[PDB]
Design a protein around this ligand. Structure first.
Ligand SMILES: [Mg+2]
Ligand SMILES: [Mg+2]
Ligand SMILES: [Mg+2]
Lengths: 113, 227, 49, 48, 231
């Protein structure tokens, strides 16, 4: 659940605005998790296309088949805008609920591996 | 061979309108997950709710633009608009449009939205945006009734050219968890203990959610009646 | 499979999802029909479960 | 005495894969093929 | 934009097999409806099975009979495949009487007929009898549910009777297909098909009906909330 997808279809195409990127992905020219570049900064289609206000929403989307736990995406968690998978958010919440402390749990885990 | 046993007792633990725990024991072997899974599916997908499906902001072209005079970007505002919990007082009402106009130094909350007939805002203290000196925010939000989760590209609704479509989070139910533990009644050792855990936004209580969920299921069972 | 196809049932939704997954894993080739891919898996001794 | 297979009995294949039966599930809990056929035994791939 | 009651199709072959279609259904309801029914169909559907066997001059299961090829373990193994249908719902148990001698191949058809009792598999092999070989049996068949091993029920009519492992479930197999379907402008709808194989004792349709009834009744259990006081 904590491993993230690395996809070869987009493979570092250059884009001006995220709308163009979303369009390219829409046509099927760029994979969701492919490492592209928009506005000179390296990102992915998934991070732009799906932006979740909170974990509950992201996991709700995973439940509806919108995205997969391994898809890299944008989730807003603890006042921070995070680029990560819903699965890593899930792990974070597992540790968090298990120890009944959100802050300490957030400190203990390594989210990015 | 002979089998006769008592109907299970339904146990309820509720904290506020946000959360509840539901225990059903004893159940025959396997029935813990037989009840639990469909209910979880129904509770997440089919429970009637409200959501913000569209947003228009003055002088704003696309979603990834920014707002001069405001620190939050358009993205961050839309996120807060997803956390907005709106309750419709009347069953007839399908869709509403909520207008918000404010300026000067201010911290805009959900309460600032101009009231509409038979529309209740459950979370008025929810923070939409902060405005600076010279900061101007004029926006209209489209609120619809629906079920489950619809991404922005799927409904794709626009009242005008600059309207930004928002991922529609309809489900009043935020999370459903269930676990089956082995329990024993007398000499029957394989019996099931069903525990359900439901998180909602308060618009619909967990008990209300579960009740609506089991009703949907029963009604679907009546579909095997007349060929 | 052919038995199923004659029995009047096409490919299942769940089978489609699993096929997407396996397609990401590089187990089946993209562009082939659901049947072709299911056969591709079956030749690897794997089946939808 | 007629001995049925039970939990804790030792099973093995000819390739050296041995294990004790830890669980007996009812048929409805078993992984099954799309045609409705349940599997008999579940072996962990971690043993390979 | 709310979907409503779907058309319900029924396709049956004999008393053994059936297919039951429900379409259109909302997304995810193919599994939501399909799976619980399958779990209930495989487990909780009541039925009939041989619960005991007495054979003349046979003290236990571990014995052989002169003139009979099969040992008693095999005879019981064959009798465990016996499918017995009851007509009258009030009837709990039947003792099938068999009397035979060889050379002959004794089948399930050779059982002496009883009122409101139908063997759904008369060609089922029972024993192989030889010149001088003589077989006299009384086999107790009961109504029941699920799998009750000989060890548990210990059912013995007379002293030398042998308890038999009883699989009561009339349902041999259950599968369900979820196919993609559409209604009007709506897409990604579910088309649900329940395929049910039984032994003939009860039809797939009956099975489906009482399975639905069991799930319904189970849903009735949520109707009496009770406060949980941990304080
Ligand atoms: Mg988006
Ligand atoms: Mg840390
Ligand atoms: Mg159990």
């Amino acid at each position: 659940i904590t491993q993230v997808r690395k996809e070869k279809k987009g493979a570092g195409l250059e884009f001006a605005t995220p709308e163009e990127a979303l369009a390219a992905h829409e046509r099927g020219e760029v994979a969701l998790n492919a490492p592209i570049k928009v506005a000179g900064r390296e990102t992915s289609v998934g991070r732009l296309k799906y932006v979740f206000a909170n974990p509950d929403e992201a996991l709700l989307a995973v439940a509806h088949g919108i995205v997969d736990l391994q898809d890299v995406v944008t989730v807003r968690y603890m006042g921070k805008r995070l680029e990560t998978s819903p699965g890593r958010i899930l792990f974070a919440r597992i540790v968090a609920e298990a120890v009944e402390d959100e802050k300490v749990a957030w400190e203990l885990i390594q989210l990015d591996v | 061979l002979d089998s006769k046993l008592k109907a299970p007792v339904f146990t309820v633990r509720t904290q506020g309108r946000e959360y509840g725990e539901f225990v059903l024991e004893p159940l025959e072997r396997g029935f813990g997950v037989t009840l639990g899974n469909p209910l979880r599916r129904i509770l997440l997908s089919s429970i009637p709710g409200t959501a913000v499906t569209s947003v228009y902001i003055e002088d704003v072209l696309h979603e990834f633009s920014t707002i001069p005079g405001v620190k939050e970007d358009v993205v961050e505002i839309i996120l807060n608009l997803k956390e907005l919990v709106v309750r419709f007082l009347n069953p007839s009402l399908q869709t509403v449009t909520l207008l918000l106009k404010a300026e000067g130094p201010k911290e805009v909350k959900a309460r600032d939205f101009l009231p509409v007939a038979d529309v209740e805002i459950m979370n008025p203290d929810l923070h939409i945006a902060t405005l600076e000196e010279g900061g101007r925010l004029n926006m209209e939000v489209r609120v619809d009734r629906g079920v489950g989760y619809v991404p922005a590209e799927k409904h794709g609704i626009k009242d005008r050219i600059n309207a930004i479509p928002v991922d529609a989070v309809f489900s009043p139910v935020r999370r459903v968890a269930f676990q089956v533990e082995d329990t024993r009644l007398g000499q029957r050792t394989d019996l099931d203990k069903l525990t359900l855990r439901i998180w909602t936004d308060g618009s619909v209580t967990p008990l209300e959610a579960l009740n609506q969920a089991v009703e949907i299921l029963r009604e679907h069972l009546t579909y095997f009646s007349n060929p | 499979f052919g038995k199923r196809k004659g029995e009047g049932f096409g490919v299942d939704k769940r089978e489609v999802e699993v096929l997407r997954r396996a397609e990401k894993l590089g187990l089946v080739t993209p562009g082939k029909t659901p049947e072709e891919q299911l056969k591709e898996l079956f030749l690897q001794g794997k089946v939808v479960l | 005495q007629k001995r049925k297979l039970q939990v804790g009995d030792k099973l093995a294949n000819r390739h050296g894969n041995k294990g004790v039966v830890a669980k007996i599930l009812p048929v409805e809990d078993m992984p099954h093929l799309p045609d409705g056929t349940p599997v008999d035994v579940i072996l962990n791939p971690l043993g390979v």
